[PDB]
Design a protein around this nucleic acid. Structure first.
Lengths: 56, 185, 70, 132, 152, 67, 60, 129
RNA sequence: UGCGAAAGCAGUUGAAGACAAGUCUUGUCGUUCGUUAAAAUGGCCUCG
């Protein structure tokens, strides 16, 4: 997906509609980003406990 | 009587049991006759472990008196029910409820005890064998229990529906004893 | 002096300050200070040397009766 | 390193205002921060003073490029969380709220940055392809 | 038994009160109905168990408020089946949020046992590498999302 | 000005870059903006880690007895 | 199957019927239920209050 | 897991209690046959009381109380009463005695004897070597 | 507890009286004034 946008970015701009035809893509990308706030929260708690015994 | 904390009347309407601060003392009195007149401190009834534990264990939330006056059921905020033999103050523990027991009622013959609380489950304790029959998934927590009829044809329950904190929502349920189906809600 | 669950020491040159589940014993049987209960249960206690004390301590499937936790 | 630990140790006892300058010293290393926290911070009061100083600094400017003060905060929380929450000082709880407020914003800021960063990369890659 | 097929076509009154038995419950549903919180979690991680159905029992226990309760009487021997699935379920989007909750609790309850258990450590090490990998994917997805907004 | 609450400014910057379009932007400036944001992303990731942290027998032993 | 009349209340009329099943049916015939009523008042007894092990069928 | 009371003259069941969840390995009773105590695999001791005058007249026992005092099976149980003693002594796979009171089993206190009381020593220490 | 959006922004806990335990020190409240202000081994029927 990343390379399709970069290479054919000029072509994609000159398209009458994008959201309706790329609704599945846009929705699919939203779900992954929603995990980011909570994945950091889990990572911080992991990183804390990983550090604790590794030094011990 | 002074400083009455909790009170109940038998199904026949001829016996009154009550608890006073005169910590506490329970007294049972015949209402139309002088035949029954007894009093005893709650401390004797309470167990020693109960005295060791928190106050939920020593806090009575329900009380029932048999028609004959021989038996008295005390329900505690811990969920434990104690039947007391009034002749000699012998104790008997029935323990199913995990939270406060809210309603107790004896059968007319005294051989069954209806109990209800926060579980939304009505339990008929068979006192001969200490067994129990259940009616679960009621609409609300059971505030009051009664056996109604010369032969115990019906059970009249009061339900509370504690989900709504903005108000107290009571529902009156009359069940058929034979098949435990709602005769009238 | 030591028992199954306690150890003690008494000095015999110093006098002390004056200030249910067993038989009541109404009938006859026939016809400077150290105390600790930290070490228990004890198999044996004795000295190895003048300043070394040896305390020897004790280091099956069961029917499951669950403990409710909320 | 040893001298800065000793200067820092003395100033913590002396309640000097130069504690902040000592914490920013460029001689501090990531392993040395652990060793100082584990070995020298034996009293709750010393732990409180360091956290109060670090928290105040980061609160004023959370976007400082100097990674050292955050590195102190990270390992102070990682290694001494139990003792830090044990502190009952009302001001310490207030400082924790102020610090959390400043950092809480940055978390909200991050998703916007990744979105901008993505567009620029496409702009950079597109120019490279046009060049080629 | 020559009248078993009558059906009462000639009679005045026909009374039907039989009720069909409910469709067969699974092991995990029976455990939840009987308030077996710890055992219901065990049924979740069993061989040949559908991933979607494994996610329901984990969601049901959370909804019932029984997440710590399901995790008390556990050691390294019986914790690995949960962590093994979490190692794979973190990758999935639907189970990512649920895995974060369960993994957060087990760390808060079994920090001490983890120090003395070497096997539990490596489970967390590979868990930290994968959760770090998921962070990169989610960061990446935001960048394509920013790219896509620019086009439109 | 930027390369020299903040997200409400950055979100305004992100709106601008979309308004500018892909053609109008210039490479030499684009490099400064690219370098600058990468610094910002590193800081935001750092603070997010800090924010979550704030939210978060032997067979033989020798001892000395106290008499 | 059998008719049953209460020994005290002569107006109480009832029919009990059972078979090779774990329940029993009672049909209240009292008042005008036998003839005039459009429907039958039928109750099913199916609860043994802890003694299901000693009882397999209501037939006898 | 059931406790049953039989009439001796007629050899017929009087009462049946489904009390335990597993085998009942031992029974005991007090001097006056006012209490019957059962114990077994499920680690519980159950009390059956016929002390009420109404109970004695009708010859009906009551499942009064039970207590969980043992960590494993209770293989042996015994009772003793005198003017100065009132014991209910139990033990089993836990390898330790448990002492209760017969008259005050429900409310009375109890003592768990240590598993090993080294009255006769099984270890010695040599200062030399 | 108040406002607010879900984010958050401000602030809050006191005086008694009675009793239980230790032996003068502590707890509790089926008791009052004021302030916007865990844990009695104890889990949910039958109708195949």
């Amino acid at each position: 997906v990343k390379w399709c946008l970069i290479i054919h970015g000029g072509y994609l701009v000159s398209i009458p509609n994008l959201m309706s035809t790329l609704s599945s893509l846009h929705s699919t990308l939203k779900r992954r980003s929603d995990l980011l706030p909570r994945l950091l929260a889990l990572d911080a708690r992991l990183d804390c406990t990983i550090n604790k015994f590794k030094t011990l | 009587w002074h400083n009455v904390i909790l009170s109940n009347i038998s199904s026949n309407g001829k016996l009154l049991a009550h608890m006073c601060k005169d910590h506490k003392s329970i007294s049972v009195v015949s209402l139309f006759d002088d035949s029954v007149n007894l009093s005893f401190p709650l401390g004797s009834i309470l167990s020693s472990q109960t005295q060791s534990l928190s106050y939920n264990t020593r806090y009575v939330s329900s009380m029932a008196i048999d028609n004959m006056g021989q038996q008295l059921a005390v329900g505690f905020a811990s969920g434990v029910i104690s039947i007391v033999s009034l002749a000699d103050l012998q104790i008997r523990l029935l323990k199913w409820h995990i939270d406060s027991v809210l309603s107790l009622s004896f059968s007319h013959d005294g051989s069954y005890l209806l109990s209800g609380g926060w579980e939304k489950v009505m339990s008929l304790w068979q006192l001969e064998t200490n067994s129990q029959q259940f009616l679960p998934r009621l609409n609300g927590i059971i505030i009051d229990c009664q056996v109604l009829g010369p032969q115990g044809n019906y059970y009249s329950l009061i339900l509370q529906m504690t989900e709504n904190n903005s108000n107290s929502d009571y529902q009156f349920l009359l069940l058929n004893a034979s098949d435990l189906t709602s005769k009238l809600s | 002096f030591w028992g199954a669950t306690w150890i003690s020491r008494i000095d015999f040159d110093v006098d002390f300050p004056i200030n249910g589940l067993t038989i009541t014993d109404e009938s006859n049987f026939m016809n400077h200070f150290f105390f600790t209960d930290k070490y228990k249960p004890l198999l044996f206690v004795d000295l190895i040397s003048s300043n070394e004390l040896a305390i020897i301590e004790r280091n099956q499937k069961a029917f499951i009766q669950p403990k409710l936790v909320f | 390193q040893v001298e800065i630990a000793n200067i820092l140790s003395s100033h913590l006892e002396a309640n000097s205002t130069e504690i902040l300058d000592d914490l920013m010293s460029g001689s501090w290393t990531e392993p040395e921060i652990k060793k100082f926290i584990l070995t020298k911070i034996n009293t709750v009061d010393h732990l409180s003073k360091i956290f109060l100083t670090i928290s105040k600094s980061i609160t004023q400017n959370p976007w400082n490029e100097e990674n050292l003060l955050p590195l102190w905060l990270k390992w102070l929380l990682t290694l001494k969380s139990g003792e830090l929450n044990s502190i009952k000082d009302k001001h310490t709880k207030k400082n924790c709220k102020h610090l959390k407020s400043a950092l809480r914003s940055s978390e909200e800021i991050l998703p916007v940055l990744l979105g901008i960063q993505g567009r620029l990369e496409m702009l950079r890659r597109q120019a490279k392809l046009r060049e080629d | 038994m020559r009248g078993s097929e009558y059906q009462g076509d000639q009679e005045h009154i026909i009374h039907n009160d039989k009720v069909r038995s409910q469709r067969r419950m699974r092991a995990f549903e029976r455990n939840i109905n009987q308030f077996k919180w710890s055992e219901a979690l065990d049924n979740a991680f069993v061989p040949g168990m559908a991933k979607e159905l494994t996610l329901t029992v984990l969601q049901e226990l959370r909804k019932r408020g029984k997440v710590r309760v399901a995790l008390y009487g556990r050691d390294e021997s019986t914790l690995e089946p949960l962590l093994n699935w979490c190692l794979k379920g973190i990758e999935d989007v639907r189970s990512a949020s649920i895995v974060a909750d369960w993994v957060a609790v087990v760390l808060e309850l079994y920090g001490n046992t983890l120090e003395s258990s070497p096997v539990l450590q490596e489970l967390m090490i590979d868990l930290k590498t994968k959760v770090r990998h998921e962070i990169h994917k989610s960061k990446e997805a935001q960048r394509i999302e920013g790219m896509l907004q620019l086009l439109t | 000005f930027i390369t020299s609450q903040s997200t409400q400014l950055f979100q305004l910057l992100s709106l601008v870059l979309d308004s500018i379009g892909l053609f109008s932007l210039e490479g030499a400036l684009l490099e400064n903006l690219t370098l600058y944001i990468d610094k910002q992303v590193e800081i935001a990731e750092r603070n997010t880690e800090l924010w979550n942290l704030i939210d978060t027998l032997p067979t033989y032993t020798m001892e000395y007895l106290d008499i | 199957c059998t008719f049953y009349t209460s020994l005290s209340n002569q107006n109480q009329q009832n029919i009990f019927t059972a078979g090779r099943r774990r329940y029993m049916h009672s049909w209240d015939l009292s008042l005008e239920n036998l003839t005039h009523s459009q429907t039958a008042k039928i109750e099913k007894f199916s609860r043994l209050y802890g003694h299901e092990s000693t009882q397999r069928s209501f037939e006898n | 897991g059931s406790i049953k009371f039989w009439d001796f003259q007629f050899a017929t069941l009087n009462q049946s209690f489904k009390a335990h969840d597993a085998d009942v390995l031992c029974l005991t009773t007090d001097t006056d046959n006012n209490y019957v105590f059962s114990a077994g695999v499920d680690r519980k001791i159950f009390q059956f009381s016929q002390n009420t005058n109404k109970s004695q007249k009708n010859n009906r026992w009551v499942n009064s109380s039970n207590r969980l005092l043992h960590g494993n099976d209770i293989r042996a149980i015994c009772a003793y009463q005198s003017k100065g003693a009132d014991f209910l002594v139990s033990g089993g796979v836990e390898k330790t005695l448990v002492i209760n009171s017969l008259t005050s089993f429900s409310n009375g206190n109890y003592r768990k004897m240590p598993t090993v009381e080294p009255y006769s020593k099984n270890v010695l220490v040599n200062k030399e070597q």
